[PDB]
Enzyme design. Structure first.
Site, PDB file in Angstrom:
ATOM      1  N   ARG F  54     -19.841 -29.144 -23.537  1.00 27.44           N
ATOM      2  CA  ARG F  54     -18.502 -28.597 -23.810  1.00 27.44           C
ATOM      3  C   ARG F  54     -17.525 -28.751 -22.652  1.00 27.44           C
ATOM      4  O   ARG F  54     -16.322 -28.819 -22.898  1.00 27.44           O
ATOM      5  CB  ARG F  54     -18.498 -27.107 -24.086  1.00 27.44           C
ATOM      6  CG  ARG F  54     -19.149 -26.535 -25.332  1.00 27.44           C
ATOM      7  CD  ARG F  54     -19.364 -25.027 -25.139  1.00 27.44           C
ATOM      8  NE  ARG F  54     -19.134 -24.289 -26.379  1.00 27.44           N
ATOM      9  CZ  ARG F  54     -20.086 -24.107 -27.317  1.00 27.44           C
ATOM     10  NH1 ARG F  54     -21.280 -24.650 -27.098  1.00 27.44           N
ATOM     11  NH2 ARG F  54     -19.846 -23.406 -28.443  1.00 27.44           N
ATOM     12  N   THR F  55     -17.964 -28.704 -21.380  1.00 29.49           N
ATOM     13  CA  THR F  55     -17.078 -28.797 -20.225  1.00 29.49           C
ATOM     14  C   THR F  55     -16.812 -30.241 -19.995  1.00 29.49           C
ATOM     15  O   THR F  55     -15.685 -30.600 -19.687  1.00 29.49           O
ATOM     16  CB  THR F  55     -17.722 -28.176 -18.993  1.00 29.49           C
ATOM     17  OG1 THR F  55     -17.901 -26.805 -19.363  1.00 29.49           O
ATOM     18  CG2 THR F  55     -16.891 -28.217 -17.710  1.00 29.49           C
ATOM     19  N   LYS F  84     -33.109 -39.965  -4.782  1.00 29.42           N
ATOM     20  CA  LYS F  84     -33.755 -39.370  -3.604  1.00 29.42           C
ATOM     21  C   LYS F  84     -33.276 -40.410  -2.619  1.00 29.42           C
ATOM     22  O   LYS F  84     -33.198 -41.616  -2.923  1.00 29.42           O
ATOM     23  CB  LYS F  84     -35.316 -39.426  -3.509  1.00 29.42           C
ATOM     24  CG  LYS F  84     -35.972 -39.042  -2.126  1.00 29.42           C
ATOM     25  CD  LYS F  84     -36.488 -37.594  -1.943  1.00 29.42           C
ATOM     26  CE  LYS F  84     -37.784 -37.317  -2.758  1.00 29.42           C
ATOM     27  NZ  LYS F  84     -38.110 -35.899  -2.908  1.00 29.42           N
ATOM     28  N   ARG F 105     -19.572 -31.741 -11.633  1.00 36.93           N
ATOM     29  CA  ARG F 105     -20.385 -30.560 -11.866  1.00 36.93           C
ATOM     30  C   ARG F 105     -21.745 -30.992 -11.300  1.00 36.93           C
ATOM     31  O   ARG F 105     -22.262 -32.109 -11.576  1.00 36.93           O
ATOM     32  CB  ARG F 105     -20.506 -30.240 -13.368  1.00 36.93           C
ATOM     33  CG  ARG F 105     -21.248 -28.971 -13.573  1.00 36.93           C
ATOM     34  CD  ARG F 105     -21.567 -28.518 -14.989  1.00 36.93           C
ATOM     35  NE  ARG F 105     -20.640 -27.510 -15.461  1.00 36.93           N
ATOM     36  CZ  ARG F 105     -20.965 -26.433 -16.161  1.00 36.93           C
ATOM     37  NH1 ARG F 105     -22.215 -26.147 -16.424  1.00 36.93           N
ATOM     38  NH2 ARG F 105     -20.001 -25.622 -16.569  1.00 36.93           N
ATOM     39  N   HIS F 134     -16.401 -22.019 -10.621  1.00 34.09           N
ATOM     40  CA  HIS F 134     -16.012 -22.759 -11.807  1.00 34.09           C
ATOM     41  C   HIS F 134     -14.519 -22.405 -12.096  1.00 34.09           C
ATOM     42  O   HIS F 134     -14.123 -21.811 -13.129  1.00 34.09           O
ATOM     43  CB  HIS F 134     -16.917 -22.350 -12.949  1.00 34.09           C
ATOM     44  CG  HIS F 134     -16.935 -23.155 -14.254  1.00 34.09           C
ATOM     45  ND1 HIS F 134     -16.165 -24.201 -14.486  1.00 34.09           N
ATOM     46  CD2 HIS F 134     -17.801 -22.889 -15.259  1.00 34.09           C
ATOM     47  CE1 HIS F 134     -16.561 -24.637 -15.646  1.00 34.09           C
ATOM     48  NE2 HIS F 134     -17.517 -23.859 -16.089  1.00 34.09           N
TER      49      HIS F 134
END
Ligand SMILES: Nc1ccn([C@@H]2O[C@H](COP(=O)(O)OP(=O)(O)OP(=O)(O)O)[C@@H](O)[C@H]2O)c(=O)n1
Ligand SMILES: Nc1ccn([C@@H]2O[C@H](COP(=O)(O)OP(=O)(O)OP(=O)(O)O)[C@@H](O)[C@H]2O)c(=O)n1
Ligand SMILES: [Zn+2]
Ligand SMILES: [Zn+2]
Lengths: 153, 310, 310, 153, 310, 310
Positions: F54-55, F84, F105, F134
């Site tokens: 959704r974001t 890594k 994010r 956020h």
């Protein structure tokens, strides 16, 4: 005669009349305790005027004497219901519900990880009037809940 | 026939004080003269639907030290049971058709007790059911308190760590309350406090308990210091590290401990007990793990045998 | 020396009627007087390249009840065999270098028979090879028909369920055809019908069979009602549920079954037999699973022993 | 106000009477169609002695007039029934159920991959083929099943 | 506005012959005279809860050849929406506040239809919902049949493969049964044949159909050969390899075909169509996939634009 | 240039009341009079090292409704960067040579802030960094509180759920404590209550707050009810089901609410808000998710454009 009360009464000869069912518990009781799985005459009255306790419900089951344990079971739902047996046309025992030792079958464990959810098991809870409330302990997960957490779910 | 003969060991709340003492006096005998063929020809199932290595290796070695055969599985890693839609009632009705006892661990609470409804008269011994019980871990703990302290009553027992989710601190508190005059000190971060139902049961039995914020408030008086692991998942990274990470024992803290004080920990210890505690005579966590052999041997001997002559 | 001494039990089509009766009379003796050290000092490999818990636990408990040691693996969950590019011929040429019999399950059909070409004279007992055979499941089924019905000929046997893919209904039909006067009723949804090669072999032997759409057409006449699970993957969600989900037995359907009628199901039963059937005296699926102990014990005894004195 | 008895219990002052309910379907109907959630007086007779089926069931809901589309949702369970509508102690209306074209809410799509199982939508089925035997088509997955089968589960 | 303006495209059943013709007319105009800025400033969401790379890429290329922007996702072991607890209805209710149209493919049937009740006035276009519908495939097959044959009526259409479970063949038969005079030949393994519902519908309209056994039988009369793939999961490997000498297509088999006959396949064509067919003139499956672009551009342009003058 | 031109948007703590008002003013203009070619020729990178569908979709739709291009990724068990050895700093240092802005994010706190030291003059916008910040969620909640209530001061804001770990509720309280006169009601399970730091800050500014036990208690006084979800991982299933009779919202509970009272939820709303709430006038969580578009368009337009005249 009339201050309406009965009108042309469903006076049964032998049976059980569960009277003063608190309104809306009337249907719960038939479902939960599977009282209609019989071939005998039942007459149910829902949301009766009973100015004297507002409104109530009432089940009349013929030639059936549901008792002792069966009566105590109803304690959690209709705490004041007077069961009445009838042998030949009149009251031969009014019996009140007492809170029982165990409540089997009809109830669900709140605990979603309790194994009773996916299994061929009949639920079973131990009743403890923890003076104020009634706590219910699950037989299987052994978790203890307020009877209101269980009776919502 | 002994009282435990062919009983199911599902919960600690079902074993009486006398039941507890009988198991513990039998563990003491088997530790002293071995009976390596007492369960000869018995076949036992070790069903660990949830893997637990520590516990399984111990249960099976105890079965091997009394002469029994073992069949079974460790899973949580898709080894065919539960496929199609086999219920647990059906798995247990088929496994009890050829084994003499079922030792079983399972993720949901209540699973061992339901196994009991389907096993016929093959006994079910519970090795952990979700967050509910683990009798055989409380039996070995008790045996280690008894064996090192000489008694199970009049103890000053401290419980340190996550007391809210620690399945074993909850049961050991319930078993020690079966006995007399024990005193409890709980030292837990606020979010990991010992639940009310424990506290309420303690209060109702007239048993003394108190909460402290550090171990040094109570070290001097203490006999058994039972440490628990805090699971970092139960807190956030920062909470764990912040002030609350001080439920950790180092050797220097033992300064004034009584000569008899013992440190116990069901394990894995990751860092709540530092490595230097091991060299102290008070470190008894591993000797506690070794004692799981005799407590599990005693339960298997008592449950499969009518009369146990020693 | 007995005829099965050191033979491979790969397929049911290789065992004669006499072979079948010898195993079944031996299972009956071991069920009656145990011989818990007959295979003392024998080490057996339990190789389940495909995991099957039910079958493995049963095979190993039977090995343990005659005194043998067991080594081996359950896999289908990457436990190092098959890595690099080790062929099965090479795995079996190394495992038969130190074990006395190989019990093995494998996903491809034919794998047990190839093991036979490489095992030297260590016998190979097949516990399932893909959709081909499973002798030890037909041996226990037969033993349970024999033991409850008193005979293996003149039976009225109904086979209900997925008859097209059910590996065990196909072999049991082949074994019962070794015997006389049995009558078959097949009740299957149309897409799951009993293949022609079975039907053709039945016709060629003069054996009577008939197809029915419900069990109530034939309940009255039936002795063994052998139920199978429909795998929902074999149909779509809607087909399974649509009309075709009526190959499900409830207690009420048993109304008029003969007093001797028995319901058998290799298992897992998921919902083709409802839970209330269990309380009927006709439910024999679990007692059937328990009988796998004696049929597997008898084959191991007969194959590893020259002369079996009883 | 009129001569009740209970064998064929009498007179509500205005409301609905669904009579000639098959037998053991009456409670099914109180459950499914949630008839119970009114504070009105409901009277119900169960396993009663006559209306030629031998035994029958009967529900009386005073002050509620449930109609035409409601009466037709009753058709898969109780098609023999008569729904009497009453005003001032007279049956001013008497109809029967007839197959609707849509049956909302009450059924469960037998297709387990249907999306209707997990979600805040009501089931809905298109109905077809009167008395020779009814097929129901899910609104969502568009699979058509035998009523026999949806009504089983 | 045009008939389909702001309409939901969920089932082929839901669109009349005239709508089908409107789409196929537009797609021929968009193929002829491109309109790259028609949906300039529209954002379409490409919600593939089930991964399908060829259908996703055909659709996003459609979106972009008409100038639109695209936000979306696909999902194997990834991407948060749904998860558990997140209902499809709340995913849609949220995404329909962000986008102007939703194209979605989902594994359960009716997911697109449930969506329609939560998208507001945002059109929802189905790209696949379990085994139910896939209208944008039927629309491109029809476009391909119309541009190769010149009409959509009076065709001799042979359908081959898994007629029982190919969702595309169920749809195509529904849609072609809205035009007139079409004759249908269905060559399936009888384990995988046309459901009686398709067949029952075709008879109420009077359409002629016949069931055949091998393409060699109808080769000479046929205008479209629509091959489907055979799902080897739904079949036993041994059955799969047994059927006649397959229903796979090779150029040898085409030596008889009509000059205008074309072979269509929704793809993938794994082994039912050999590589030599690829070079005959009758091969049309890749041109069929290129027409996917023109069919989905037409549907998007009609749904999102009121009047389209091209 | 505007105050936020080429600024990094990392913590709500970092933006004054005036900046917050500038954003909310712009978002109301962009909602009113769209500007689709404002960021024409900008390429933004949508680096979701943590998947959030959704974001991610709200942000890419923001990017595209202002005309920008988008390159980026999301990541569950996939997509090479980080791996890594690849440091976040070298990923950023490389991606900041390709793009004009970075929205990211990431699961560890301060990832967005570390990024800021390697992006050069490329603005970095935080879409979530562990349990820290956020800001684009706080900005859309404030926009939603401002357009429903008409102001951002003198509000009676009730916050409910996991106040201890909802990052959105920590941020929202910080931000609303920059406006004046706001009264705060905090209804949490005490195992999940407001950290003392939020509470300690609120008291240095003199803001009024109170802790309550159930929404039924404050229903009548409240203008915003901001529900949060209860993380059932952070809880024992048995505790989770025990709290009062929950803090879930149903329409029955709303029978008391003020006419202009709205229920907000960052979503997902799994079971703390029942479906009947969805149809009351007080439900505003989906409109709250639609305003996400206008809030993130405002932030992007201000960061990437020097002066914006709209
Ligand atoms: N032949 C009979 C006798 C009694 N009843 C029922 O049995 C119940 C018993 O009540 P009763 O003791 O007769 O007088 P109540 O005051 O109604 O009892 P209570 O004080 O418990 O309300 C009444 O509801 C009545 O309908 C009946 O149906 N038929
Ligand atoms: N005020 C009234 C009048 C009638 N009834 C009920 O209405 C039902 C049927 O109405 P009616 O046409 O009067 O009796 P029938 O002619 O037998 O109806 P039918 O032939 O359809 O059975 C009867 O069960 C009767 O109990 C009632 O409860 N209250
Ligand atoms: Zn429980
Ligand atoms: Zn459906």
């Amino acid at each position: 005669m009339t201050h309406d009360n009965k009108l042309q009464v469903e006076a049964i000869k032998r049976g059980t009349v569960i009277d003063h069912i608190p309104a809306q518990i009337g249907f719960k009781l038939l479902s939960l305790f599977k009282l209609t799985e019989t071939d005998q005459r039942i007459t149910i009255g829902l949301n009766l005027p009973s100015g004297e306790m507002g409104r109530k419900d009432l089940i009349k089951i013929e030639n059936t004497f549901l008792s002792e344990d069966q009566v105590d079971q109803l304690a959690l739902y209709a705490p004041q219901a007077t069961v009445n047996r009838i042998d030949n046309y009149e009251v031969v025992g009014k019996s009140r519900p007492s809170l029982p030792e165990r409540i089997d079958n009809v109830l669900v464990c709140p605990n979603s990880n309790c194994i009773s959810h996916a299994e061929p098991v009949s639920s079973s809870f131990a009743v403890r009037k923890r003076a104020n409330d009634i706590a219910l302990k699950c037989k299987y997960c052994e978790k203890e809940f307020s009877h209101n957490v269980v009776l919502a779910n | 026939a002994n009282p435990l003969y062919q009983k199911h060991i599902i919960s600690i709340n079902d074993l009486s004080r006398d039941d507890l003492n009988l198991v513990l006096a039998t563990a003491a005998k088997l530790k002293a003269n071995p009976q390596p063929e007492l369960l000869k020809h018995k076949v036992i199932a070790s069903c660990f639907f949830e893997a637990s290595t520590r516990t399984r290796l111990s249960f099976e070695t105890s079965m091997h030290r009394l002469g029994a055969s073992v069949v079974g599985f460790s899973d949580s890693a898709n080894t065919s049971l539960g496929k199609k839609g086999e219920t647990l009632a059906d798995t247990i009705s088929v496994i009890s058709t050829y084994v003499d006892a079922i030792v079983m661990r399972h993720p949901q609470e209540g699973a061992a007790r339901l196994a009991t409804e389907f096993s016929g008269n093959v006994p079910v011994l519970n090795a952990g059911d979700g967050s509910n019980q683990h009798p055989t871990q409380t039996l070995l703990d008790l045996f280690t308190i008894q064996e090192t302290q000489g008694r199970l009553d009049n103890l000053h027992v401290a419980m340190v760590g996550d007391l809210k989710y620690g399945r074993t601190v909850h049961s050991l508190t319930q078993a020690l309350a079966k006995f007399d005059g024990n005193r409890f000190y709980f030292i837990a971060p606020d979010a990991l406090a010992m639940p009310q139902y424990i506290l309420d049961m303690l209060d109702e039995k007239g048993i003394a308990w108190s909460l402290h914020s550090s171990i040094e408030e109570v070290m001097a008086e203490v006999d058994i210091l039972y440490m628990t692991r805090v699971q970092k998942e139960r807190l956030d990274p920062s909470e764990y590290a912040n002030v609350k990470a001080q439920f950790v024992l180092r050797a220097s803290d033992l300064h004034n401990a009584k000569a008899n004080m013992k440190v116990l920990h069901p394990l894995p210890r990751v860092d709540e007990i530092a490595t230097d505690v091991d060299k102290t005579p008070h470190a008894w966590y591993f000797q506690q793990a070794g004692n799981g052999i005799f407590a599990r041997q005693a339960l298997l001997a008592l449950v499969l045998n009518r009369d146990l002559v020693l």
